[PDB]
Amino acid sequence: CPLMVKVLDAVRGSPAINVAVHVFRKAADDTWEPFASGKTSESGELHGLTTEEEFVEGIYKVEIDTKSYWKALGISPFHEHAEVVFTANDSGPRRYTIAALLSPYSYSTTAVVTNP
Amino acid sequence: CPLMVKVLDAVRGSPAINVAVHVFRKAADDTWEPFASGKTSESGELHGLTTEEEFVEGIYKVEIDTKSYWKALGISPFHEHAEVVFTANDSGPRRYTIAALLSPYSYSTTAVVTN
Amino acid sequence: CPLMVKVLDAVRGSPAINVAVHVFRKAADDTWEPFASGKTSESGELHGLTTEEEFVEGIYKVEIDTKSYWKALGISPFHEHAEVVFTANDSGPRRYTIAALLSPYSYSTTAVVTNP
Amino acid sequence: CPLMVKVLDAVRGSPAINVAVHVFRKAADDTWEPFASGKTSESGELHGLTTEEEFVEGIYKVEIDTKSYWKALGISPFHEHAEVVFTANDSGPRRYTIAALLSPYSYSTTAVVTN
Numbered sequence: 155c156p157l158m159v160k161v162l163d164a165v166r167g168s169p170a171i172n173v174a175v176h177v178f179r180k181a182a183d184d185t186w187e188p189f190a191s192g193k194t195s196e197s198g199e200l201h202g203l204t205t206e207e208e209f210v211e212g213i214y215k216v217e218i219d220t221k222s223y224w225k226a227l228g229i230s231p232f233h234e235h236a237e238v239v240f241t242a243n244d245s246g247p248r249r250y251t252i253a254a255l256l257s258p259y260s261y262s263t264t265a266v267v268t269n270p
Numbered sequence: 271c272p273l274m275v276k277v278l279d280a281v282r283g284s285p286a287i288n289v290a291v292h293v294f295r296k297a298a299d300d301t302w303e304p305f306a307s308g309k310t311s312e313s314g315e316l317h318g319l320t321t322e323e324e325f326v327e328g329i330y331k332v333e334i335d336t337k338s339y340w341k342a343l344g345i346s347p348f349h350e351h352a353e354v355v356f357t358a359n360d361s362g363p364r365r366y367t368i369a370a371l372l373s374p375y376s377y378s379t380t381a382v383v384t385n
Numbered sequence: 386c387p388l389m390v391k392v393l394d395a396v397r398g399s400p401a402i403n404v405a406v407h408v409f410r411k412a413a414d415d416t417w418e419p420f421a422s423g424k425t426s427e428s429g430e431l432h433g434l435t436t437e438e439e440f441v442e443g444i445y446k447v448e449i450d451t452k453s454y455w456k457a458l459g460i461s462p463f464h465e466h467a468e469v470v471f472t473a474n475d476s477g478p479r480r481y482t483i484a485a486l487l488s489p490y491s492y493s494t495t496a497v498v499t500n501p
Numbered sequence: 502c503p504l505m506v507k508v509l510d511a512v513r514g515s516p517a518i519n520v521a522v523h524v525f526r527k528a529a530d531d532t533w534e535p536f537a538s539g540k541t542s543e544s545g546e547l548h549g550l551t552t553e554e555e556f557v558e559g560i561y562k563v564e565i566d567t568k569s570y571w572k573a574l575g576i577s578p579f580h581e582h583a584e585v586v587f588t589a590n591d592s593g594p595r596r597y598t599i600a601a602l603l604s605p606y607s608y609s610t611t612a613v614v615t616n
């Protein structure tokens with residue numbers, strides 16, 4: 155898969171399961187066009203968002219619904235979401251893993267980029 | 271100062287100086303309206319963004335221009351910017367510090383909410 | 386594997402390859418006894434450190450040689466190592482993944498604990 | 502103050518108050534000799550650990566007693582403590598801030614080295 159998202163919970167030491175993820179691509183007219191969406195699995199992973207053919211050069215936004223995640227565990231968290239915005243495929247096709255580590259008042263995000 | 275931003279550089283172990291920071295407030299039509307902005311100081315800090323009077327409950331976005339920071343250092347970065355989006359709530363403490371720790375391919379953001 | 390270590394580099398957006406890892410177990414006499422060691426793979430992962438039979442209850446120390454990693458990329462980093470110290474298997478056998486995200490002046494560590 | 506420690510709690514969005522902190526210096530026999538210690542303040546900070554005079558080049562360990570902090574809050578933690586191990590170098594800036602961001606199953610530590 156050229157785009158994978160992996161979400162972990164820093165409070166429980168576990169994958170963050172059933173987290174909603176929305177991917178957008180910046181259009182010709184400079185607005186955020188829907189691109190792909192899905193929910194993390196029991197492993198905290200979301201695969202199958204796109205293909206190398208559909209995943210062209212552009213600016214992409216990955217929006218992870220962290221607030222719904224925490225509310226369902228009884229936690230009122232600080233952030234509305236974790237958003238990752240990046241230029242993709244500008245030097246040709248790459249594989250991108252977007253990792254997010256969640257706490258109620260903090261998150262970190264990291265990208266692992268590989269060249270197939 | 272109800273809203274402060276602090277930016278650190280995890281590569282140099284230093285404040286992140288002269289980083290542009292834009293704050294937006296979400297309007298009734300769900301667009302982002304410019305609210306406040308500035309550049310981080312030599313201490314990596316930005317204060318004086320707003321007043322108790324104007325910082326009412328609502329949804330706010332803090333955009334940190336990380337890509338320009340890394341480009342100035344000659345380091346290829348991943349993100350276009352770091353965005354922090356949150357609801358300001360009068361039930362909680364009165365002072366919000368948005369801290370960001372920057373690396374070229376990773377950032378972390380934490381909220382410290384006191385008084 | 387009941388104990389796995391995964392090391393990422395936050396400067397390059399890549400696995401941290403060939404990182405030395407040393408695991409110790411706190412002995413009867415309260416010193417750190419060598420337990421296992423290895424080097425991360427091209428995926429930044431170290432598997433095969435131990436077995437469920439050898440990996441008994443105890444206090445374990447995972448020591449990741451981050452300073453040698455950065456020096457070989459031409460970086461003089463802040464830390465000597467990243468050390469993760471934890472009680473394991475106290476409520477029965479678990480699977481532990483110790484993840485470390487490295488920057489020259491910062492690191493984070495996270496544990497993912499699963500119950501087989 | 503050449504050495505300061507700052508601890509934040511990522512679950513509550515607050516300073517981590519009354520956290521024990523022990524600093525050690527590595528001796529010639531490669532054992533850790535007690536150097537300085539204290540409890541974090543209401544601001545999550547510990548200053549006055551050492552003086553410019555006594556903080557000479559060497560290898561130092563800062564141990565943060567995270568497990569007692571989480572136990573006091575009724576939250577099951579993973580780590581026994583967070584350890585930060587580093588060489589103090591006179592070629593670099595003169596002020597070391599060791600920052601730690603705590604979650605029950607994760608911590609991050611950053612060094613901010615200034616002046």
Ligand SMILES: O=c1c(O[C@@H]2O[C@H](CO)[C@H](O)[C@H](O)[C@H]2O)c(-c2ccc(O)c(O)c2)oc2cc(O)cc(O)c12
Binds near residue numbers: 285313368
């Ligand atoms: O280092 C960190 C830090 O403290 C810094 O200490 C240095 C002194 O030299 C700086 O220059 C600067 O003054 C100050 O920001 C704070 C912080 C403390 C108190 C607050 O109220 C607050 O909102 C944030 O949060 C962090 C969060 C991370 O995820 C990673 C970090 O490394 C830090």
